[PDB]
Amino acid sequence: IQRTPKIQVYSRHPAENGKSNFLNCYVSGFHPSDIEVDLLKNGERIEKVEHSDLSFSKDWSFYLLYYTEFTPTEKDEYACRVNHVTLSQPKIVKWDRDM
Amino acid sequence: GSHSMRYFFTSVSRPGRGEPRFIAVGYVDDTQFVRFDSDAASQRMEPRAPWIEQEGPEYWDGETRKVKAHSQTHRVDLGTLRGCYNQSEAGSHTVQRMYGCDVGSDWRFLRGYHQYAYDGKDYIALKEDLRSWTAADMAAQTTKHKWEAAHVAEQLRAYLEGTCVEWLRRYLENGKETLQRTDAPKTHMTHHAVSDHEATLRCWALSFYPAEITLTWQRDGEDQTELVETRPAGDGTFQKWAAVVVPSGQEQRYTCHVQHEGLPKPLTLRWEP
Amino acid sequence: GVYDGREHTVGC
C-alpha cells in the first residue's frame, strides 16, 4: 500500500562553472503524497527552493520536482535530503556531474 | 500524432487539523495549462500556460465553480469510504481521479477514459467501450449497481465526446506555436571505467518534446541495459539516458538507437575518440 | 474545461 520514492538529482542545463543554472530533484513513484524534500548546499539547506504540483502516474504513484537557481563552482557540493514515511532514515542523494 | 486532455484530482484526508487538501491540475499532452490548490488564499483556478490567460472572466468563474463542486464530492467520498472499511478516525487516506479524451490525426474522437482510485488501489473505471464499469471488489460491486441506475455512464460519455473534443480542438487552435510543436533531442554518448578491465557506455538524449522516446542498446544486431524514468527539465522539455555494462576492448561493437517523433530517421550512436 | 455535468457520490 506504500512505496518508496525514486530520487534523481540533476541540472537543467549542462553545468559550467560560472554560468547561471538550475538544480532539480525529481522524486517519483512514492505513496502517499506526504513527503519532505530539501535541496542542500555544503550540507546547509537552501532557502529559496520551489516545487511543481502533485500529479500521479498511470499506477497512482505521485511525482514532484523541486528546483532552485545556482551557479556551479568547484568548491561547492549539493545534495537533496529526501525523507518519506517508508524511509526509516533520510536518504541523502548527492549531485555528481556525470549522471 | 494524437492529442490528449487529462485531469488529475487528489484529496488527502487530514484528520483533526481541518479540511482535506485538494489539488486539481489539468494537462494538454505533456504541458500543464491550468491549476488549482485548496491551501492558497486565492481560491481561484489560476492559469499556468501563457495562452489561456487571454480568456474572459466567465470562463474562470465556471472553472472555479466546477472545481469546487469536485472538491465537495471528493470530501463525501473520503468520508463514506473511510466509514465503510471499518477503519479508525486518525489516519490519512487519499482519493484520486482521472479522465480525458484522445483525438486522432483528423482531430476527431478516438478514445476516452475515466478511472478512480483509493489509497493507490484501483476502485472503479469505465471500460474501453464507455458503456460499463470494471468493479474490482465488493465496495466497487455496490458502486457499480448504484451508478448503473442513474445512467452516470451516459452523462460521462456525452460530456467526454462532445465537450472534451470541442474544448481540446479550441485549445489546439489557440496554442498553435506551443501545443503543436515537436523537438528533436540532442544526443551524445559518454564513457566511464567501472573496473580495471571494463567500461560503462551511456547514451544521452536531452531536450525533446513530447515526452515519449525509446532508447535501445544493440550488440551489432541483437538487443539486451538499465533505463531511467524520463525526467522533466523544468521548462517544458525532457531528458533521458540509458547505459549498459560492457567488457573492455569491445567498445566499437555497441550501438544506441533513438526513435522520436521529431526525428524523421532513427539515430545510431557509436563511440569515437 | 473540466467535467460540467452532474456529480455523484461513491456509496456502499
Numbering used by the authors:
A (entry chain B): 1 to 99
B (entry chain A): 1 to 224, 228 to 276
C (entry chain C): 1 to 12
Tell me what the authors wrote about this structure, in their words:
The recognition of antigenic peptide-MHC (pMHC) molecules by T-cell receptors (TCR) initiates the T-cell mediated immune response. TCRs are expressed as heterodimers of α/β or γ/δ chains in complex with three CD3 dimers (CD3εδ, CD3εγ, CD3ζζ) that are responsible for initiating downstream signaling. We also determined cryoEM structures of pMHCs containing MAGEA4 (230–239) peptide and the closely related MAGEA8 (232–241) peptide in the absence of TCR, which provided a structural explanation for the MAGEA4 preference displayed by the TCRs.
To further investigate the structural differences between these two peptide epitopes, we conducted cryoEM analysis of MAGEA4 and MAGEA8 pMHCs in the absence of TCR. The maps were sufficiently resolved to define the conformations of HLA-embedded peptides. The side chain of the central R6 residue was not well-resolved, consistent with its flexibility in the absence of TCR. As expected from their conserved sequences, the structures of MAGEA4 and MAGEA8 peptides were highly similar. The most notable difference occurs at peptide residue D4. Taken together, our structural data indicate that preferential binding by these TCRs for MAGEA4 is likely due to interactions that require the peptide D4 to be in a down conformation where it does not interact with HLA residue 65.
